Amino acid sequence: MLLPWLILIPFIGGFLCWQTERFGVKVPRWIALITMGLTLALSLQLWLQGGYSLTQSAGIPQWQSEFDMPWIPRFGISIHLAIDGLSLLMVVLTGLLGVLAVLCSWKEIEKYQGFFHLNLMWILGGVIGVFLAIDMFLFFFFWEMMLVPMYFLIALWGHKASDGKTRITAATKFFIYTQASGLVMLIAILALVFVHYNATGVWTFNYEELLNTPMSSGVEYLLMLGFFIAFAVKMPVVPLHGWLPDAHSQAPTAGSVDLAGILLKTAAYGLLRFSLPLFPNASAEFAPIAMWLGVIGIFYGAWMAFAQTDIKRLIAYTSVSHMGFVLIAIYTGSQLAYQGAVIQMIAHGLSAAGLFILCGQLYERIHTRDMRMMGGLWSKMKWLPALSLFFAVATLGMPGTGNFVGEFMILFGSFQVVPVITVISTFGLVFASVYSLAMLHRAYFGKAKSQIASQELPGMSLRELFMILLLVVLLVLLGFYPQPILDTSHSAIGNIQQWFVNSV
Template sequence: MLLPWLILIPFIGGFLCWQTERFGVKMPRWIALITMGLTLVLSLQLWLQGGYSLTQAAGIPQWQSEFVMPWIPRFGISIHLAIDGLSLLMVVLTGLLGVLAVLCSWREIEKYQGFFHLNLMWILGGVIGVFLAIDMFLFFFFWEMMLVPMYFLIALWGHKASDGKTRITAATKFFIYTQASGLVMLIAILALAFVHFNATGVWTFNYEDLLKTPMSHGVEYVLMLGFFIAFAVKMPVVPLHGWLPDAHSQAPTAGSVDLAGILLKTAAYGLLRFALPLFPNASAEFAPIAMWLGIIGIFYGAWMAFCQYDIKRLIAYTSVSHMGFVLIAIYTGSQLAYQGAVIQMIAHGLSAAGLFILCGQLYERLHTRDMRQMGGLWSKIKWLPALSMFFAVATLGMPGTGNFVGEFMILFGSYKVVPVITVISTFGLVFASVYSLAMLHRAYFGKAKSEIAAKELPGMSLRELSIVLLLVVLLVLLGFFPQPILDTSHAAMSNIQQWFVNSVSTTRP
């Protein structure tokens, strides 16, 4: 019974935040914090229950806990939620970053506090819904539902870009990209249900029934592309990444944390959970194209990050580069690479969140995100530059941080399957060090600008320091002890890999 509450608590909490604004400015903040804290505690409670290590030989999904309630029985649509190791880890990450998102926007947001927290909570509720829903119609419902609050978050509380673009432009661009790709996925989901109905005479949107849908090769390929396009926009895969730099750089800090830490992961999760198992033959055929797109993303993201002067745009492009590794891992069909992809997603969520939170703190002090206006800050602000340096080296895959474990496992697992692509993508790590060090150099070293040199900049407050230190501790723990995460995700990844490999080697039932 815990599963529906994981989704309901953020929705109810968000509504309360909105309504209690009239009783004082502090109320919504505290309610939002308690709401996300409760969600995080519930997800950890599910983790402690255990039962995530069961695998099935055929690779049929094995759920640790399920919740089913009929919704529109005529079309076989039900409220069907289920959790396994993969979705559990993503839900815990969402809960954790949700708490941090509320904390880091404590001082930043001045106007419409209640409505801000309503949007923030509803995005997180929608994301948890995406990770738990295994009825395809319900999955789509949550997938679309997290867009509208994100639009408001960027449009109402965003910052103006350093190149003069407005936040409304960024929000609209994000909305059009994701809405259009969502439409493609809706058509693919409906077509899949229709193909299933033609074959069996039963209307259903249930994931486990649709796994066994017989279909011709051409139909499978077209439907797989429908899913791939929707996930590729969200992930984002170059050339469908146009919304990302603007949305990231203009969103408020909490929005950036959610975008980089969680929203991009919904796409990788969707590919692993739906695109591969539902269309294994088409995915195997499409794999080389997807991997080359991943490589283009790695290099393009790194190169564009190096060229940026806006510090938030720089971090946004690093996400494009990192998700390229995840994309390559997803299409290798290697168990080790899949496990690496999970670690990489969690580590990237933590390190990108850390960088965005530090950028928000810099912006509160300097009121600029342009690195040409910075420089010489190393001795000016206590703690902040050193912590930025930690996250920058974590981003480039420093041993001892979770990012290294993820990238190493991805490269190691992919090498057996696609040696050429793996060797090329390894060079992406070299470029990662270039943009990370360039960011540090431009912002914190060199000669201080006269207006900054004259200013007295406050050090980090206890709240700011504790948020960032928590992320530091988690990243280092993930770097030294990834085993609990690997144990939790192992069965889920093994099931996906078995189903994918077995279905490719035999024809579909």
């Protein structure tokens, strides 16, 4: 019953943020901070109230908290929300990243900050609705509504150092990719619904009603392929990955925008929630192709991330490689690999958020993103080089940070099922360390290759230091004590894996 308010509270908060811009320029940032405070507090209240640590696995479906309302009775379509351990973890991470976003755009005294904030909270509400909703029309609607404000910020508020045509091109590329793949997802959903209606005789778009359908081999493969195409371009999965670094490099320079819209963990959530339980035989047949696509994505993203002179593009390719690791984890059919995928997803979100915030602050210091004009910044800047080194240590899979834990549980489960892809992926982790060290050598260590790095630069203020240190503390706690996160999502992972492997 609290899930509709979880979705709408960012929307009404953004509405008051837009309406309160007449009261003052510095007003809507506070209102956005309070409504993310209520969103995060309600998510933590659901975490403490649901009782997730001692929850048994009752099979699919087993929802901790559900809400039902009719939306289109003609098609039998409901606003149907359902939260479990995995969705709760994603919602908590989403609210945390929204708080970090509203903190990272605190120094904007622009004339139209109200619409920027409004689009930010609408993005946050859209991704929260993606995580919470299980009805396929509502899931698709949230999936596609979280695109328009993000496209508007990339096109309008983006990288001021570049021309407007480049921002227009990047925003249009991202929106075209995501929306066309959403249309393919809608075709798959519609075909599944029509087959269920032909087999039974009931109009329903609900998730639990569509699982028990007579699925002929060849049609189920096509439905799974459409779902995987959408969740693969939005993961990203190669070659459907060209929009991610274009959207990152032409994003607004505050760094809030990358935390809000691009850093979604929704594609692998859809893979675990929709692609695997609805199509067990199709995914069982398709698993070698998806795992080899994950291998190609990992090594390709490492090879791009070594060869980029732009740091934001480099971190985008880090995201590509880590989501390729998660893609390898999804189609293995192991509980250990799934828990590792969840841990790696949360750790990648935190580490990439810290790297993006530090990159934005660094660009505010030196007024350039090109890594060839900077060097020896350890002796010129106060706090940022050390924290950036910590986050690049985290992003290569270092113990004491959750990325090592997530990747290693992924590889343990994979080697339990497939050995060769595991060993090739672990060599991919060698390449991950290679590009992380290359970025640290090309950015912070060496001699000053220009004049902007030859002068002493101002240090970070208390707010950016506090949010970066909070991210550091959460990364250390996740790396050293990942147990509560594991028992939080032990039930939904158990149900999904049991539905995947006891059905074949």
